Structures are given as C-alpha cells and as structure tokens.
Design a protein around this nucleic acid. Structure first.
Ligand SMILES: *OCCCCCCNc1c(NCCOCCO[C@H]2O[C@H](CO)[C@@H](O)[C@H](O)[C@@H]2O)c(=O)c1=O
Ligand SMILES: *OCCCCCCNc1c(NCCOCCO[C@H]2O[C@H](CO)[C@@H](O)[C@H](O)[C@@H]2O)c(=O)c1=O
Ligand SMILES: *OCCCCCCNc1c(NCCOCCO[C@H]2O[C@H](CO)[C@@H](O)[C@H](O)[C@@H]2O)c(=O)c1=O
Ligand SMILES: *OCCCCCCNc1c(NCCOCCO[C@H]2O[C@H](CO)[C@@H](O)[C@H](O)[C@@H]2O)c(=O)c1=O
Ligand code: CA
Ligand code: CA
Ligand code: CA
Ligand code: CA
Ligand code: MN
Ligand code: MN
Ligand code: MN
Ligand code: MN
Lengths: 237, 237, 237, 237
DNA sequence: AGCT
DNA sequence: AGCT
DNA sequence: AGCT
DNA sequence: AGCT
C-alpha cells in the first residue's frame, strides 16, 4: 500500500483507534495512530491557518494551527524522513466526513521545498502558491469528492449548493509535479507547507478533519477511507 | 499540430527558410521563421545565460543571451499571448542537430509564473529552479534523445561515450506540472525563464541550436524535427 | 533639489498645472507634470491595489491600478532610468492633501529589485513585504505627517482622533536600506512594487493623491509640497 | 555593551577561554564562550558554505558548515531568542586575526526573515542576496578593516595587494536595514542566513575565524576585539 | 464634477 | 606554542 | 563563414 | 454516543 506522512487536523475523537478525547492536531507516520498529538481548539465556522515545517538539519516535523486573535496549537515529532518516504513524493491535502460531517474548505495552499547538493552546494527548489482555485485547476490532481472553483475555493469533501456539508465523503488534492523531498547527496534540505481552511458543521460533533500529506507519487484514496481514516490509510493499524 | 511560442538560440544559418546569414537569437510565434531576430556572437565551448521575460501589462516577449565579460544580444517582440497560447501550457527546453552538430548541454534552468485575480487581487505563483539534474529527474518529461545526470547536466541531444555530439538528434525537457500562463480574469500576469547552456562543436560549424518554448500541455517532438526545425515544428512554414 | 521618479495616483485635477480634468494615474519623471497619464475611476472608501514594474531590457516603466471586480487603469512610459536616477536610491510612498482632503492609508507595500552582473552572471536581490505596519517600524523612514501602527496601517497624511482626514498635510515613508536600482555593468536588472491603499473623503471632492517614488538616498519632503505637489516636488514646473 | 547572538567559524583554539583543542563551529549567546561547539575540518584555501536557521516553533538555532564533496559539521542549541535579543536587530558578518592570520573572504551572503501576525495571519518579510559586492556597497555598513569590491568579494579583514592576510585585524559588515527578528504578537517567525567564505593562511595555525551575528541595531566593533574575540565581544567572559 |  |  |  |  501507499506510504503516508501527514499532519492531521482531527475534529472527531475516535477513541477506539487511540485518538485523544478532544479535537487535536497530530503527526502521522505511516499510521492513522498519531506518533504525537496536541489539543486543538477548533473554531466552527472560522478561517484557520496551518503551517508545517521540516528540515534535514533538525529532522523535526513541526506544525502550528491557529485562528486570528486566539492561542495556537503546535505539535512536533523527531523523524528522519529519509528512512520513511521515497526520495520522490507527491504532496497533497486530504479530508473526510463519516456519520458526522463538516465543510473541509481550503482557501489557500502554498508549498516550498529546497535541496542543496553536497557536491556543488547549488540548490534545486520548488514553490507553488494557490490563493484561488479555478474550476479547471490543471496543476492539481483531484481525487474522490474534491472539487475546485466554488467561490474560488477547494472543497475537499461534498457540500450542497446552499453550503451544507455531506456525510460519508472523502476527497484529496495533490500537486501535479513530483517533489524531490530528500537526497542522501544533499547537504541541507527543507520544506514548508501552509494552508488556510474553513471547517463549519451544523452537527454538535463536526467530523472528520483535514490533513496535509506526503505520499508515494502514485498515491490514491484507499478503499473505504471515509470517516476516521481521513482519506489517507487503508485501515486503523 | 502543437501550438509553439519559443525563444531560439540558433547557431546555424538556414538562409533557405529565412534565417539571417549569422548565428542569431529569435522569437518564434507558431513558426520556425522568427517574427524577430538579433545577431548572436555564440562562443563555442563557453557557458552562456539566457533570460526570457513577459508580462500581461506590456505584452512584449523579450530575451537576453550573453556570456560573462561579453556584450549581450537582446530581442523583443510585441505579442498578446492570450491570442496565441491555450490558457494552460507546459514549458520546456528543446535542441537539435542535423548534418552539423554540437553539444546542447543545460547546466541550470529556472522558471517563475504569477497570475493575480481581478476578483480578489490574490496571486497564484509557480517557481522551479534546477541547478543540478539527477539521473532520474521525475519532475521533468524527457522527450527524444534528452538525458539527465551526466555530470549533473541535462543533455538535450545525443552525446557519444567519447563525449562527441551526434548529428540528426532532437531532444526536449518539459516541466511536469501544467502552467496557467494567462487568464482573462487576471489583472496582472508575468513569467520569467533563465537557463545556462554549454554549446561545444568540434566539427567546425555548430548546429542547430537550443530553444526555450511554451506549448500545449500534450506537446511532443514533431516527427523529423531534427536540424533547422529545432525539435519544435513539423515543417519550415 | 532631489531627483524624483514617481507613479502618481492623482485624485484631484489641477488643470492649471497640466493635470487632465479627471482623477488619473501618471508617470512623473523629475516633474509633477506627468510624462504620461491614464484616466482613473478612483472608488472612494474601497481598498485598491497598485502594481509598478520596470526592467533594463524593455526600459518601460508601467503601472496598473485597480479595485476588485472593476476594470484596471494602466499607464506606461519608455524611460532609461540610468539617465535619470543615481545608481543608488531609496524607494518610498508619498501622499498629500491641500484645501481638499482624503485618507491616504497604506495597508500593504512590497518591493523587489534584482541586478545580474555582466562579469559573473550572478544576481544581487532585495525584497521586502509589509502586510502590517507596527507603531515603531524601524525599517521605515517616516517623513512629515506619516505615522504607523493605527489599525496596523501606514497613514501617510494626518487623520484626526475622530477619524477625519486633515487638509494641508504631507507625509512619506521610505525603506531604510539604499537600493542599487541600475548598474552599467549589470546584464539585466528589474524592480517591482505593489501597494494596497484606502482613500476615503467625506468632504465631497477627494485630494490630492498617493505616489510610489524613487529618489536620491537623502530625499526629504520639499518644503510647502502639500496639495498638488504630492510631497514630491518643490514647484509645479 | 552590545547584545550578540552569533554562529562562529573558529579556526584557532583559545583553550584559555574554553575553546576545544581543534577548529570548531559554535553557537555564541552573549559570550565568546560558545554554549555549544562541534568539530570543524576547516580546509585552508577552499571555498566553504555556512547555513544558519532558526524558527519560533522549535526555537533551535542550527548551523551547518561544509565544503563541496566533504562531510559537513553541524551545531544546534535550543534558545528562545525573544529572551536574548531586542525585537529589532541588525544582522552582519564579522572576522578577526591576531598573532596568527588568515583571509576572511566572503564570496556571497543571503538572509531571509519572516514574521506572521497572530491578529491577521499576514506576513512581513525581508530578503537580501549578495552574490557580488561592489566597491561602493551602500546597503552595507562596513566597520573596522572590512572592504568590498576586491574581485567582487567582501574582505572582512586586511589583505595585501598579492592576497597575503595581515595579523591584528578586525572587520564587520552589517546590512543597512534593521530587522524585526521576533514579536510577541507573531504566531510564526523564522530566519535563515547563508554565506560562502574562503579562509586561506600561510601560517601552520590560521586564526581567528568568521562569524554570522545578530546584534542591537547600533552595534560597533568592541574596543580591542581583534584575535580570539572575533570582533563581537568586549572581553572573554 | 456639478451646479448656477 | 609557551609555560610549568 | 571561408575558401575556391 | 453507545455499550457494558
Ligand atoms: O450527541 C453528539 C455528542 C458527540 C458525539 C461524539 C461521540 N463520541 C465519541 C465516540 N463514539 C463514536 C465513534 O464514532 C462512531 C461513528 O463512526 C462514524 O462516524 C465518525 C465521524 O464521522 C467516523 O470517524 C467513523 O469512521 C464512522 O464513519 C468516540 O470514540 C468518542 O469520543
Ligand atoms: O557564419 C556562419 C557560417 C556557418 C555555415 C553556413 C552554412 N553552411 C553550410 C550549408 N548551408 C546550407 C543549409 O545547410 C544544409 C545542411 O542541412 C542539414 O544540416 C543543417 C545543420 O545541422 C540542418 O540545419 C538542416 O536541417 C539539415 O539537417 C551547407 O551545405 C554547408 O556546409
Ligand atoms: O471630476 C473631478 C471634479 C473634482 C473637482 C475639480 C476642481 N475643484 C475645484 C477647484 N479647482 C481649482 C484648483 O484647486 C484650487 C484649490 O487648491 C488647493 O487645493 C487643492 C486640493 O487639495 C490642491 O491640489 C492645491 O495645491 C491647493 O492646496 C476649486 O477651486 C474647486 O472647488
Ligand atoms: O607552531 C604553530 C603550531 C600551532 C600554534 C597554536 C598554539 N596552540 C594553542 C594556544 N596557545 C596560544 C594562545 O594564543 C596566543 C596568541 O594570541 C594571539 O593570537 C591568537 C591568534 O591570532 C588570538 O586568538 C589571540 O587573541 C591573540 O591575538 C592555545 O590555547 C592552543 O591550543
Ligand atoms: Ca479522528
Ligand atoms: Ca537555423
Ligand atoms: Ca493633481
Ligand atoms: Ca578561538
Ligand atoms: Mn487523530
Ligand atoms: Mn533561426
Ligand atoms: Mn497629476
Ligand atoms: Mn570558539
């Protein structure tokens, strides 16, 4: 199956698979059972920002999720991604709903990756920035229920015409180009991802969450991965 | 056929298809017969730099080609690319040889494109920078004789084991992601490309040249486009 | 006197010094009497965006001023800045009021300048981006009535405690670092500036405007340059 | 006195002030006695690269120093710079010689700093890149013996016409603009610095080293700070 | 830019 | 490299 | 682009 | 929120 590294914004506690009993952010290394979590004060109907960073010096994957004028949540985990991911990856956003639901609306997404060669000390870099999504966004691979262009946003999961989120939905968007995320012959490598999101639910319990993820290039939504599996994992192992 | 906009670095005068009688840089709009040329003092065996710029305000495609401590060649042409290219494109480098030959070696390639929306005044951007090419460069589409990784360079046309360039060769490299090069609903848009190149010919007269090009996403090398057609055009019309 | 190149967003027609009879954008080369103008449909109380671009290949100074979901105004003028400005400059924003008034509020300002050496083909670059201004913004030189930090904005001209703009006010903000805007030994050079602005007038007719300008490093507000002189020029010559 | 945070490339063991008995890289927090060091295989006469990184999420200052095709040295130290530096700083390079000497030649210097506001989630950024230094580099403050333009390089300490380094020399270069390095109201902040250097000595023991530093804006070379104090500290406390 |  |  |  |  696929190889996944992800930062999850998990709106729904699935205590049966080791979620904490509160909405949380997590670092997922090849499992939906986060290697590290932090409590997250998700604000229903508010636009939030997620920031994810990693470099090959510290080998610490860190995320910050925040809303304007509120305290941020942060989670960090030490991991050598050279030992986890393939050298070449795709990067993407994923989201799901299950019995309970929410909008999984992405208003912006940026990514930057850099590799400096040990042999020449010259740098290879990729950067993309989406502040608006068009109805035909040819540099995004849309999987499952994901759609673009509705008010210039990326709707990862199904929403009705009047903005009501639907249950049992999963969708993802991957950047078209493969990304060279590590190289043994690189002296320094880094990436950063940022996205803005709007999670809104009429349900007393919103579900299930949004994730930024890094995968094998040919990654697809695993069969059955609605709800707690966030469109990333084939099972809850 | 494909739709091509290109900046040619033409090392071989084909006077029978309207080339000037000297090595030259040109702007090619849907024809190998340049809309505009400038004289180019190509320096056999020296690393040079090409810089290509366009924005939606001036709608003037401009190029500068130079070698360190020499005077540059510059060519400009007014063209509304909204009336020539599809909205979504790929960008690439092309080169060819014919009965005369040369190395068509690319040492670096960078590209930046930006679109600012009329409705939100927010910007979408893409940037890539290759200062080294690997043996398996998954974010490049290699066509024809193009190879990567030989001394960390992109060799657009065939070079033998003994290092000598081959005749009748054509090759191209395209960036994997489609590029949104214009949008009627963009208030301002721009792109810039830069590459560094090394053209070496032992065989007296070098041929045929290198081009930076913008094409339909599904562009392929036209069959028989060796020599004066520079891997870009199916004929000399 | 100082040496000024500016893009004016002129909200008040001064027909006695050669303004057109409508609010307009202009290119000012060493005179308040614009070398080129375009009609500008200024929208009282709306946030707008100005984009200014120049490169050493085309030597065409261009500006686009627009509001979301409205048609832009654009103005261009061919000028070799090597023959007008000193090699080293400061860049700034200026605004004024006179017997008529307006808020001259700056919400964001970004600037990028690049110089590529003819001898090495290596690039020197400067970039700054202000999306918020603090009460003590040590990388800005504030002149005249300019203040920062009020709602995170840069107020170029005086606004009273009750929020109403004052007449006969002039103020400017310059970036602290000198900028190398041209070099004879540069093979390619460029700059771009962007700012967002909010011009509000209760007093019927708004005056006088905002300008982006480039000056000698030691530029100061010319004494008496309120009203039609836009904080840039000592007289209307 | 001044407040200094520095990354030292220390070529000369001063065991009397707690240097290790080998050339080393160090993190200096308000003292020449490094809070952390790593062994450094300095290569006399070779061009090296230094990379320094910090962000407000991890609050870990890290450096990597390397030469092409050799193993890098890395040093990291956990420090909350909000508790060390003033909010506004200058950034610079410093170097010294004493009884023993070396060239302290800087071939390139880049710096990037970003602050994201907790209230708006908008970013303020500064970036500069010097790949060549001119004889009159108006955006650098040169202190002590530092000179620019000799072969397009920054010579931090004194060198003769034939390239022979001089003893008892100290010099620094600071970027002209103040830098907003931390803000309590910033949700995420980062900086990165890179420079390339050429340390060459005819002496069996080269001395004394190069440092990247962050200081109070009005920082000057302390009296007597040649040799082991690297132009940064007034004493060896 | 619109009213006298 | 000097000083104990 | 230079030699016959 | 259900299941023990
Ligand atoms: O009355 C509303 C109050 C809050 C309700 C939250 C329940 N608390 C709770 C659960 N229990 C249920 C485990 O989830 C069952 C539903 O499973 C389906 O729906 C979810 C959400 O969409 C999805 O994750 C699943 O995959 C599945 O589709 C806890 O463990 C806990 O805490
Ligand atoms: O100052 C510049 C002088 C350089 C040589 C000028 C022309 N040399 C030349 C020609 N010219 C006729 C056209 O070329 C015929 C050969 O055509 C094949 O080779 C070229 C080069 O690779 C290619 O462009 C064509 O498409 C074709 O493959 C000669 O016959 C000769 O010698
Ligand atoms: O469609 C556009 C119509 C807007 C009003 C047109 C003119 N209005 C106007 C004039 N015109 C004469 C010139 O202005 C005289 C006042 O001058 C002072 O005020 C202006 C504005 O702040 C300033 O530019 C000058 O430098 C001076 O401070 C009137 O007299 C009147 O009413
Ligand atoms: O024959 C050469 C072999 C290597 C010589 C290195 C000495 N080893 C050593 C020292 N001892 C001397 C302490 O430094 C004395 C000189 O001080 C002056 O020169 C240095 C270098 O320029 C400078 O740092 C000082 O500030 C002063 O100007 C150790 O402690 C160690 O190891
Ligand atoms: Ca969950
Ligand atoms: Ca040709
Ligand atoms: Ca006016
Ligand atoms: Ca030392
Ligand atoms: Mn979870
Ligand atoms: Mn041609
Ligand atoms: Mn005017
Ligand atoms: Mn030390």
């Amino acid at each position: 199956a696929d190889t996944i590294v992800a930062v999850e914004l998990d709106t729904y506690p699935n205590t049966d698979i080791g979620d904490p009993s509160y909405p949380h952010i997590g670092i997922d290394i090849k499992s939906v059972r986060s290697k590290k979590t932090a409590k997250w004060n998700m604000q229903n109907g508010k636009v939030g920002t997620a920031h994810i960073i990693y470099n090959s010096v510290d080998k610490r994957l860190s995320a910050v999720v925040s809303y304007p004028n509120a305290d941020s949540a942060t989670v960090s985990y030490d991991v050598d991604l050279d030992n986890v991911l393939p050298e070449w990856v795709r990067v993407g956003l994923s989201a799901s709903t299950g019995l309970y639901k929410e909008t999984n609306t992405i208003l912006s997404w940026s990514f930057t990756s850099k590799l400096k060669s040990n042999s020449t000390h010259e740098t290879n870099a990729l950067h993309f920035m989406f502040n608006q999504f068009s109805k035909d966004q040819k540099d995004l691979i849309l999987q499952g229920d994901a759609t673009t262009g509705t008010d210039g946003n990326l709707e990862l999961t199904r929403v009705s015409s009047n903005g009501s989120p639907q249950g049992s939905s999963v969708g993802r968007a991957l950047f078209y180009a493969p990304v060279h995320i590590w190289e043994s012959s690189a002296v320094v490598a880094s990436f950063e991802a940022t996205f803005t999101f709007l999670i809104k639910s009429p349900d007393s319990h919103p579900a299930d969450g949004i994730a930024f993820f890094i995968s094998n290039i040919d990654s697809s939504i695993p069969s059955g991965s609605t709800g707690r599996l966030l469109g990333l994992f084939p099972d809850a192992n």
